[PDB]
Design a protein around this ligand. Structure first.
Ligand SMILES: [Zn+2]
Lengths: 60, 59, 155, 206, 80, 24, 98, 127
RNA sequence: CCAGGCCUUGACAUGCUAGGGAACCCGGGUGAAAGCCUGGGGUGCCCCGCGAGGGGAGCCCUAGCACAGGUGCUGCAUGGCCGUCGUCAGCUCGUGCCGUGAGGUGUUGGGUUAAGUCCCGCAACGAGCGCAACCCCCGCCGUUAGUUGCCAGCGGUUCGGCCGGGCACUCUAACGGGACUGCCCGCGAAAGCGGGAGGAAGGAGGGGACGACGUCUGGUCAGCAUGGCCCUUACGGCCUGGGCGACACACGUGCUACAAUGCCCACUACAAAGCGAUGCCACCCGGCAACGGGGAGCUAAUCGCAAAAAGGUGGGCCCAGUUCGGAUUGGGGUCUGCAACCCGACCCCAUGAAGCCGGAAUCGCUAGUAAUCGCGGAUCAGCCAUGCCGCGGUGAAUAC
């Protein structure tokens, strides 16, 4: 995540097809979840601390 | 159109773009995929028998 | 199996006849767990026996099995850095198992088109002491006393 | 690696979420982003205050950020000058008009997050790694604690081969889902590298 | 068997740039990256230079090659 | 018949509908 | 006919909150249908553990959004007194449509 | 008058109703045989009745929801069993030896990750 | 990443010295875009002696500066997190005792266990990390709860649980019960083992989550962070087009099939778990059709995705490279989207390849497993997903 692409991808583009997602936190973009807005790494790192409400550990 | 006439329309249809510098055309000359497949693996239907070449050691 | 002998699965008898030997047989025909089909195969395959043979298919079935259970077999063994075929007396469990399995592996090799038929016919030629289900039997035993030169090891 | 962040494993029987509220689908992602923004100031400005936790109760338009400090006589400031600032510097970010409560930390020695930090600063002051650790552990043991434990990342005293310093007393059953072991993590930045401090503190039972 | 529904696409970059070449008659060389565009009968006979990955291959247009696109005339892959 | 995109199971597989698998 | 829906993340937080609405409702209201679960909707999260590349790792995370309901037929201005501003939970949302 | 029993199996429930009658089975208003047409082991349902020579003394108003037709069988079967105690509790005497008041967790096992099913691990070639 | 065109206190932070301007907004020229040039309207808050105007805060440009920026090397400089031996049953400590000492004992031996699990014994007695247990799902049942559920019991039907009416059942979900080798027989010094019974369930009832001390200098500086060296008119920044999809080949994971225990068409029946606002789309209509026009319902136990498929009945096929198989190619369409040539999926007509069950060799799986069948979701305009992560339907064999 280069500052050049984080702050970049935020600006409104000339084509809406162009607008991709990035993690609000890490800057990763390979695979962020819409529901939270974070990278699959960041999702974890937080879920653990408990900083994402109602987000428990699955078990069945 | 059936045999006597189809096998003709297609044959020439192929030459159509062949005669022109048409990408799709080139694929026809090379005997590769045309509709957009990969040429690293599974494409044995357009090339046919496998032409095994040599490689190099690593051990 | 390393700690125990491992209990053998008890099956549910048949809804029609009630012999569990039946259930075992079908299970062996069943592919992709289509047990509803496998059942029909056996059934209509019995109907063929009534129309072509003047006997009760239940008993016929049994005599067929009874007649394929090979009573002698071979078991590979590395005795002195070599593959010596060691004949041995076969147990009741294995007999039953081998029979059904061959009745079907041979069956499906028949030149016949319909599957219910193919089975029906194997159950007949069986009793009479022929076909190929019984051939895979005599072929085995023909290896038993064939190398009975070696029956002097384990058991 | 093995292990599983103790906390994340316990929010179920005992240990609540660091931000408990509710949300839809359209607001969740947004809400949370603003949340994380909050800590991105508290952590910065409330360093020396001995921060610990940041509870966050949301509601309609109203919001409440309870901040646990070791040394509140700092967050507060002179008669109520800094806490005044922290609210305005706060609304500058969130257009939500939110309160900020402050709860003194009953014994900073029993608060894993803090404990970890304690070591950290000590490592930046070029202190003695091995010793720094041992003392740390006893501090927790003397007061209360049914079990303590401190770890370190690597490059103890700036060596050329990062190692790990192990140390603990009492019990620390990271396997007993009815423990209630706090776990802190520091991150000292030294001239030769980054080193990671980890606390673990066993408290009570059922 | 490819398709663009109802409304053939051509980039206004050269469209209105090529039509200004008919008022005068003919031209010689054109250069525009847009290869996205389908070829119109109104372009026939012109000598357009389309961009490769690095080069700018000129492409002469004929009556029989109108049903295609510019890109179909720019080979990108260098082989053998 | 899972690759014959012009049969019953053919669409079922790709999950599309056409002249061989309609909407009723 | 006050329809009361209670959506929340903690079933304890709802249970109580749904009890709080149930208690002072029979005190000043009339015949209450009690609290009823739905369903409850979950949001699974299958993420990989290591930030590197080990597909076979993967940690599982869930997010249950429980749903509760409390109906109150024959609504009196008295009932709407006790249940006007007598709440306590923080991670619970309510919506009424009558 | 009315004999309910409750019969659950493999995520499927079956409402069991035994009224004294001629002996017929109505499932969801449909002729028993018309519903279970082609089902070989279908007959299994009635095994518990034919257990106490009680074939044809009761009727069968049975419903069912969930599961699979070839699991709806065992489903009813159990059900019929449970209602039968109501009529005569001393019935276990012949029932349990046949084990019809048993219920096994034969449920479909959770799909584990990394794998391709419950156990089915993916194959490796050169190790 | 490559090409070509363009940019430099720079797309982003904090700030400094000099000079000019509220911010802002709306055009045009050149252009592939970015960028460059150019033009207009436009003139706020502060503080001052009325005015004129003067200094100032924020904001903008310009010139210089501190610095921004770097997916640029180094995972043998590091954090964190993960893979791994290994869910294996071990790894250790205090004190006591043994030994000049390194160390030993305990932890071992005999029995037992899934287990350093427990019994007996013994210079040891304990303890820690690990096993187990506490926690979640599944199976029985109880209480609390009734807009799911039903003639279960009564009254009407457009006979659709549709309506009333009713919570009983199904359910839904929150709490609690229930198995402990407790009972009986035999074996045993004990631990425990075998067998039986009552029970929904047995000896850890099925599955989860859960990985010790350490090992590999494991992996990862391209997630993040970070010591260090390296670039700063560029190793940076914007853009357009190309590339990551290249092909004589080779190997891995898989998908489709070689067919009659089958293929096709038709009519007909059981599922679960998920997701849905500009989103799921009922329903009508146009079209072979993908789709489109129209338009209701749902904010979702009350609407929708939806059809489950295999199965079941009828009928067609007749053993053919075939009504098996669907590759490739021609043709014509739909949709997404700025744009589908490179390089999208989908429909339809035609084409109908290899392939008739696989060399040496090699994988998985011990029960609702495998095998087989369909369904859902994440990501996502769309989609190259036959992948992944879950769901249930049916349902084996076999272990000396
Ligand atoms: Zn992130």
């Amino acid at each position: 995540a280069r500052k050049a692409l984080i702050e970049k991808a935020k600006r409104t583009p000339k084509f809406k097809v162009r607008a991709y997602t990035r993690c609000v936190r890490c800057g990763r973009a390979r695979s962020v979840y819409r529901f939270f807005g974070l990278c699959r790494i960041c999702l974890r790192e937080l879920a653990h601390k408990g900083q994402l409400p109602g987000v428990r550990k699955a078990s069945w | 159109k059936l045999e006597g006439e189809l096998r003709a329309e297609v044959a020439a249809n192929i030459k159509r773009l062949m005669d022109i510098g048409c990408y799709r055309g080139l694929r026809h000359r090379r005997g590769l995929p045309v509709r957009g497949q990969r040429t690293r693996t599974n494409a044995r239907t357009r090339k046919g028998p496998r032409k095994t070449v040599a490689g190099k050691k690593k051990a | 199996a390393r700690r125990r002998r491992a209990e053998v699965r008890q099956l549910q008898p048949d809804l029609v006849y009630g012999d569990v030997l039946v259930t075992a047989f079908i299970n062996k025909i069943m592919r992709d767990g289509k047990k509803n089909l496998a059942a029909r195969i056996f059934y209509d395959a019995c109907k063929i026996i009534q129309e072509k043979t003047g006997q009760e298919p239940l008993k016929v079935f049994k005599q067929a099995v009874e007649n394929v259970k090979p009573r002698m077999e071979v078991r590979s063994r590395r005795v002195g850095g070599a593959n010596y075929q060691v004949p041995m007396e076969v147990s009741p469990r294995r007999q039953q198992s081998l029979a059904l399995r061959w009745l079907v592996q041979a069956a499906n090799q028949r030149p016949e088109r319909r599957a219910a038929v193919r089975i029906a016919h194997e159950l007949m030629d069986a009793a009479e002491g022929k076909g190929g289900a019984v051939k895979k039997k005599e072929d085995v035993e023909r290896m038993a006393e064939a190398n009975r030169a070696y029956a002097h090891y384990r058991w | 690696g093995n292990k599983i962040h103790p906390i994340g494993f316990r929010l179920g029987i005992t240990r609540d979420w660091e931000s408990r509220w509710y949300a839809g689908k359209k607001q969740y992602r947004h809400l949370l982003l603003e949340d994380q923004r909050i800590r991105g100031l508290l952590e910065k400005e409330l360093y020396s205050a001995g921060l610990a936790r940041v509870d966050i109760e949301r509601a309609a338009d109203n919001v409440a950020v309870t901040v646990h400090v070791a040394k509140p006589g700092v967050v507060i400031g002179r008669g109520g000058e800094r806490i005044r600032v922290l609210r305005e510097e706060l609304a500058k970010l969130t257009g939500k008009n939110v309160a900020l409560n402050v709860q003194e930390v009953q014994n900073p020695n029993l608060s894993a997050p803090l404990v970890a930090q304690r070591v950290a600063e000590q490592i930046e002051r070029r202190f003695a790694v091995r010793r720094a650790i041992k003392q740390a552990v006893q501090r927790v043991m003397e007061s209360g604690a049914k079990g303590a434990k401190v770890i370190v990342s690597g490059r103890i005293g700036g060596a050329e081969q990062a190692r790990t310093e192990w140390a603990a007393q009492g019990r620390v059953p990271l396997h007993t889902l009815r423990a209630n072991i706090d776990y802190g993590f520091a991150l000292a930045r030294t001239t030769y590298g980054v080193l990671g401090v980890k606390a673990y503190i066993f408290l009570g039972e059922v | 068997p490819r398709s663009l529904k109802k409304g053939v696409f051509v980039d206004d970059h050269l469209l209105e740039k090529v039509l200004e070449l008919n008022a005068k008659g003919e031209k010689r060389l054109i250069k525009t990256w847009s290869r996205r565009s389908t070829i119109v009968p109104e372009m026939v006979g012109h000598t357009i230079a389309v961009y490769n990955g690095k080069q700018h291959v000129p492409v002469y247009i004929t009556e029989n090659m109108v049903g295609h696109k510019l890109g179909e005339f720019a080979p990108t892959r260098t082989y053998r | 018949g899972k690759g014959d995109r012009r049969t019953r199971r053919g669409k079922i597989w790709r999950g599309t509908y056409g002249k061989y698998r309609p909407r009723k | 006919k006050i329809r009361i829906k209670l959506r929340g993340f903690d079933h304890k937080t709802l249970d109580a909150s749904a009890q709080k609405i149930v208690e002072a409702a029979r005190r000043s209201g009339a015949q209450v249908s009690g609290p009823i679960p739905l369903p409850t909707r979950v949001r699974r999260f299958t993420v990989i553990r290591g930030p590197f590349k080990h597909k076979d790792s993967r940690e599982h995370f869930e997010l249950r959004t429980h749903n509760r309901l409390v109906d109150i037929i024959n609504p009196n201005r008295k009932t709407i007194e006790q249940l006007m501003t007598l709440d306590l939970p923080t991670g619970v949302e309510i919506e009424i449509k009558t | 008058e009315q004999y309910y029993g409750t019969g659950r199996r493999k995520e499927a429930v079956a409402r069991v109703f035994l009224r004294p009658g001629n002996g017929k089975v109505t499932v969801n208003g449909q002729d028993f045989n018309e519903y279970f047409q082609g089902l070989v082991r279908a007959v299994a349902a009635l095994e518990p009745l034919r257990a106490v020579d009680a074939l044809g003394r009761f009727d069968a108003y049975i419903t069912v929801r969930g599961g699979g037709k070839s699991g709806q069988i065992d489903a009813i079967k159990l059900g019929i069993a449970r209602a039968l105690v109501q009529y005569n509790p001393d019935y276990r005497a012949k029932l349990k030896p046949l084990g019809f008041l048993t219920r096994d967790a034969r449920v479909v096992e959770r799909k584990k990750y990394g794998k391709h099913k419950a156990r089915r691990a993916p194959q490796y070639s050169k190790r």
